[PDB]
């Protein structure tokens, strides 16, 4: 009964609150997408746009929560780019060992960081891993996590090495399936990194609208923003 353009009207305030809180580039993308929904000619068109807003907004709030830089998908570095720029002396061997699985070079995680020496810098990778493991162990939130390890090598105290942190996030109903499929996708890379002597950590996590608001991977303040905007929108597009 309600037209979609009209649905976007009633949600003007919640979406203004949403756009005001996201990072700039993230806000703009969501703003363009919202106008796409308002001007949607089809229901499939408006649903697809909303799905995108859901993922892009959530990742902007994930960045804010973690004091990480939000990186638009178009600007996200690939695994090959990180190896070439963080581990240049191993890039040739990386290419050779990816001849059978060249798709690995193009893997693009949501976040691709390295320890502070287009890959972002993080002061401590282990600190990020620990807070993921803490919330998983405290709130029962599903994660998967893997660290490359050559043979049975021990960590060492007399020398520092460069390392990568690869993070996948998401806002979708099937959280377990998200983290199980992510770690499986990256398992071959981790084993590759192990053979190259490159230290990497992969983390994957997910939230859905049934998660208790105090238990998400984003600040509860950001949860209310998503629930009041995008999640309500999905209800309106179905019921109308």
């Amino acid at each position: 009964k309600k037209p979609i353009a009209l649905i976007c009207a009633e949600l003007y305030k919640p979406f203004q609150d949403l756009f005001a809180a996201l990072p700039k580039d993230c806000s703009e993308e969501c703003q363009t997408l919202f106008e796409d929904i308002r001007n949607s000619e089809s229901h499939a068109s408006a649903w697809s746009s909303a799905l995108r807003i859901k993922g892009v907004a959530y990742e902007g709030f994930f960045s804010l929560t973690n004091s990480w830089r939000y990186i638009p998908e178009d600007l996200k570095p690939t695994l090959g780019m990180a190896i070439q720029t963080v581990f240049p002396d191993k890039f040739e061997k990386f290419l050779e060992r990816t001849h059978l699985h060249p798709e690995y070079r193009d893997f693009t995680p949501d976040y691709l960081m390295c320890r502070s020496r287009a890959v972002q810098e993080v002061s401590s990778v282990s600190a990020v891993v620990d807070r993921f493991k803490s919330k998983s162990s405290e709130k029962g939130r599903p994660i998967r996590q893997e660290e490359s390890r050559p043979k049975t090598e021990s960590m060492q105290e007399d020398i520092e090495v460069d390392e990568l942190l690869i993070v996948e996030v998401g806002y979708q109903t099937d959280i377990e399936g998200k983290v199980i499929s992510d770690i499986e996708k990256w398992k071959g890379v981790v084993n590759l990194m192990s053979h190259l002597g490159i230290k990497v950590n992969v983390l994957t996590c997910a939230d859905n609208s049934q998660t208790p608001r105090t238990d998400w991977w984003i600040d509860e303040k950001y949860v209310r923003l998503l629930l009041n905007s995008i999640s309500y929108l999905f209800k309106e597009l179905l019921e109308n």
Partner: antibody
Amino acid sequence: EVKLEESGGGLVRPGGSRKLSCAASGFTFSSYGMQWVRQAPEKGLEWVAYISSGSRTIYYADTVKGRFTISRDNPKNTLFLQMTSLRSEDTAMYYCATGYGGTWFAYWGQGTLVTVSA
Amino acid sequence: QIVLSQSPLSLPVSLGDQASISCRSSQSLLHSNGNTYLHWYLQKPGQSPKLLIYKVSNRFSGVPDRFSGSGSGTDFTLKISRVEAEDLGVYFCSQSTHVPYTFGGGTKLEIKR
């Protein structure tokens, strides 16, 4: 001077439990990994466990996995070994050790003797 | 586990002569960080062990310079250029490249008489 001083050794019945301590002095304990090594009488050296400076990384010899726990208290400059389900084969002198900058055993305590017998 | 094979098991040597102790690793001890974590210890009778050499060839501070180490990969050697009476005891190699850290079985240095 760097000194490591173990305590807590003694006599335990098989299946029993014992907690060892190691008091470290003469260096900034909280910045370094700490280790336990043991030696059964007349036998060679066997590494037991390793704990990183901030306790994030812990390794165990396969013969103590599931039975021993290594831990530390950095404000009190103390390293611990909690031993459980002890067996006669665990009878040994227990040394704490550190590399003071590496995973090698550069400094050793005088050791503490643990006898597991009924 | 890494297996460290020491040879000989016992080494009789006259005071003032050189001694050489071999340590062979079942796999390479070269770590992906570029270091090789093979180390040498002396345990004098009734005492705790003492570090002599760390990462193949670095003499530990204060260790007398008659001790030196060499090698690479899986093959390492501890040399005492001129044996003294105080060098009596058991020499161990050990490795901390891989978990578990492991020791050789020990080489007993015996003063010849």
